[PDB]
Structure formats: C-alpha cells, structure tokens
Curated annotation (Swiss-Prot), chain B:
GO terms for molecular function: acetolactate decarboxylase activity. Pathway: Polyol metabolism; (R,R)-butane-2,3-diol biosynthesis; (R,R)-butane-2,3-diol from pyruvate: step 2/3. This is Alpha-acetolactate decarboxylase. Induction: Strongly induced under anaerobic conditions. Activated by ResDE, Fnr and ArfM. The gene is alsD.
Amino acid sequence: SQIYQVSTMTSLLDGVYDGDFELSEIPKYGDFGIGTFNKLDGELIGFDGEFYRLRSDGTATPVQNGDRSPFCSFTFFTPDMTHKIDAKMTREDFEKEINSMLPSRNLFYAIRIDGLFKKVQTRTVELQEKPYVPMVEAVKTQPIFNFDNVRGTIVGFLTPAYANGIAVSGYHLHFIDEGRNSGGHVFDYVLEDCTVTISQKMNMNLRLPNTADFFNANLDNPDFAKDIETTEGS
Amino acid sequence: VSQIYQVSTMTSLLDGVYDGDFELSEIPKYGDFGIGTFNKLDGELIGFDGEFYRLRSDGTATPVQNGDRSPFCSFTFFTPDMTHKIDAKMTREDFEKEINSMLPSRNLFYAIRIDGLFKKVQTRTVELQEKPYVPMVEAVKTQPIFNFDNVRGTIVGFLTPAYANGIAVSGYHLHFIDEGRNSGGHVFDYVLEDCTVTISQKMNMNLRLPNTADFFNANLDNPDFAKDIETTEGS
Ligand SMILES: [Zn+2]
Ligand SMILES: [Zn+2]
C-alpha cells in the first residue's frame, strides 16, 4: 500500500501555491488525507472518504469536483493497529508513546485519533493574492484557533526523516470537530480520551505537478528543514 | 511508464544495510533501464533496453538472473523524450552543466543515457562485504577503481532533484558498461570523445521500502548524510 504524495513541501515553501491536482481524483488515490488548496485557501482533511476545506472564517466545506491543490497526501486507510488513550495525555507524551510502538521509524504511517480533546490548537492558512510570498511570510498572519473539551478527529501522517522536504518529517496532523465546522492544521493538543488507529505503508508515490510554476520553482533552500519547523509549528 | 521505481534509500545503504529483499526477477515489472547495487554490495547494477548486468571488481559483467537480490536500485521504462549530440571532446563538468541547462526543470526526475566513445571513464565497483557489515563510508575505502581510455560503451543513470537527496543521490548518478560487456562500474569522472545523449523525463517517483528487519531497525537519522553521500559517490 502507498502514501500518494502530491508535490513537495519545499515547493510550498517557495510560494508555489497553485497546483494542478484536482480533488475530483481523490477517490482514485485514497479515502484519508491532509493538505491544502490552491492559493492556500484553507486546510484539507479527510477520512472515511469524506474530505473538507477548513477556512479561517470557522467553516468546513465538503470538497468538490474542480477544487485544486499544490500539496496534499492521501492513502487508503487500513486499521492495522489500534490503541486506547484512557485519560489526560499531552501531545509530547502521546507522540512519544506512539513512536515507541511503531514497528519502525523508517516507514510511513497514517494515524487517526477519534475522541475528546481537552485542548486543540490549530491554524488555518488563508487565501493568498498574487504575487505570492514565501510560506514563512505567508503564515505570519494566519488565524490560530484554540478549542477546549471538544469532540472530533485528529488525522494525519508520520513521515520518516529521509522524506523531510518532500513531506513533513515526524507527525503532521490536522483536526476537525464532530460538528464538521472547525479545526485546521494542528500545533498542539491534549487528549482527554481517544481511540488511536494506525495504518502502515511500505510505499510513497510522489507525483509532481505539470505546472510552469513548479517547473520554474527554486527548490534549493539549504535551510528548508528549519523553515518547515517554522511554518508547521506554533 | 511515468515513474522512477526506487528500491529503498541511500541513507539505509550508508548505515550498512546491504541486504534487501528486492528480487531482480521482478525488474521487468518496473523498468527496462536502471542502476544500483546487489545484496552484500556484491557488484554494480546497470541495465538498459531490458538487459541488466552485475559488474564486479574482477573485471567481469554477468547478466542478472532470477534470485539476485538488491538493497538499493532505481528503474524506469525509458522513453526517448530528448536527444542531443556531443560532437567533440567534452569534460564531465562541461557536459553536466550543458545538459543541466537544457532540462525543462531541475525539479523533475530524468533518466539519461550516453552512447558512444569516451576518451576517459573512471569507475569503481563496490565489492562483496562480510557480516557484520560496516557503514558505507568505511566499506568504499578499499573499492577497486578502474580507468578506461578511448573506450566504446554506454553511460547510464539518473538525474535526481535535491529534495530527494538521501532517498536517491541528488544530481547525476551514472554507471558505465563497455560495448564488450565486461567492464565498467559506478562513474566518478569521464571525458566524452563523441556520443549520442538520450533523456527521459519522469513526473513520479515511487519509493518501495523493503520488508526486512534490517531496514526496519536501521538508524536513518544521520544529520551528516549529504556529505556522506558526497564521500561515497566522489572519487
Ligand atoms: Zn498541514
Ligand atoms: Zn552507483
């Protein structure tokens, strides 16, 4: 089984926010995934075949037909491992407990947390206007949301270090509430109680966009790893 | 048809994981063109037009067979998307900068083939290792190095974007085999006398991870991997 990877994180860093991947094709490649949309117009999250665009106006809109993306990741989720979080557990505690239970730090995993969270902190990237700026600049004015005692789902991927720059090394997680209105890209969280489900994948298929923007992008940033830490963290 | 099929990672090779589970009987499922190595680092892999060889330090080149295994290799179905002629004497540096300027993008994957006569080719052939394995930086210190003069044959390999360094080898990664199919190896340097160039552009890379305990348990978090790849791959 595979992670289907649409373009690279370093292209997003360089301000290439317009891709040619059409979300009408999501069912060909997975029923689970995360990412963003063209122009950075919102956060993508989906699982069980149901995908949403989360925007900074506090809405979550089902994805449709000609929605496009410069960057996203999909898989067909299979429940290979399950784990229960009984009581309060912080992100640092959780992420450390899970990665100690992985068969290998050298494989790809999809991960889903379903339950109640004491806290979740998210961002939602917002629509950008041309000419685009690099992502480190673009996220400085992102909306940040703090949720308390909220029911919902955190979903995303664990990525081995050797793929950092194609994807985001380590945990990359998005959140949507049970009411399907709010969430975004996750910075931090505390679990009250949840069920964990993990899917192990032995392949990553990277698909590069057929766009002039991607062809002409400058992807030779020696500081990309620190720039990813900056854009993806609080 | 539009992918590089990538078997495991260069950083796993760096860590001394020389035994994979990829069986070369399955090469025809994934390409007719490629390079890499074999289990135990027993020789260099090269193939094109569906014909693959194991190049060893003893100056032989043996056709690959059924149960040959590899920890690291790259394949594609080669399509002649671009052609170019090198009319006269041209150094590696000349050539690599001439081709690189002609690529549609430095952000895509390419297969590349040079067929003709080379004034010089310098190669290495990694040699069979005995367990317990040492890291690749140590393993290559005693590699056989060959120098060929005015030789006819084929240089073949891949151009890899910088974002995939560590999965594969960023930039040019090229192997060589002579027309007599006996000699060659992993290319360190070369001077073209005259050759035909053919290039194939790919929009996908599919990375396949081995189902081996060795790979599962490997330490792939070497902050210095890029320099270590420089070391093992130049002269
Ligand atoms: Zn994200
Ligand atoms: Zn090589």
